[PDB]
Design a binder for these strands. Structure first.
Ligand SMILES: *C(=O)c1cnc2ccccc2n1
Ligand SMILES: *C(=O)c1cnc2ccccc2n1
Ligand SMILES: *C(=O)c1cnc2ccccc2n1
Ligand SMILES: *C(=O)c1cnc2ccccc2n1
Lengths: 8, 8
DNA sequence: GCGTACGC
DNA sequence: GCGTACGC
C-alpha cells in the first residue's frame, strides 16, 4: 500500500 | 552516467 | 492493491 | 559506464 514507484 | 538506481 | 527514478 | 525505491 506503500508509495515509494506505484501508488496503491 | 546519471545516479538516480545505478551509480555509473 | 502496483510500479519510477537518468544520464558522465 | 547500470541499476533502487515498499508496503494499506
Ligand atoms: C501495500 O501494503 C501493498 C501490498 N501489496 C501490494 C501488492 C500489489 C499491489 C499493491 C500492493 N500494495
Ligand atoms: C516503484 O515502481 C517500485 C517498484 N518496485 C519496488 C520494489 C521494492 C521497493 C520499492 C519498489 N518501488
Ligand atoms: C551516463 O550518461 C550513462 C549513460 N549510459 C549508460 C549505459 C549503461 C551503463 C551506464 C550508463 N551511464
Ligand atoms: C535505478 O536502478 C534505475 C533503473 N532504471 C531507470 C530508468 C530510467 C530512469 C532512471 C532509472 N533508474
Amino acid at each position: 500500500x506503500a508509495x515509494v514507484x506505484a501508488x496503491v
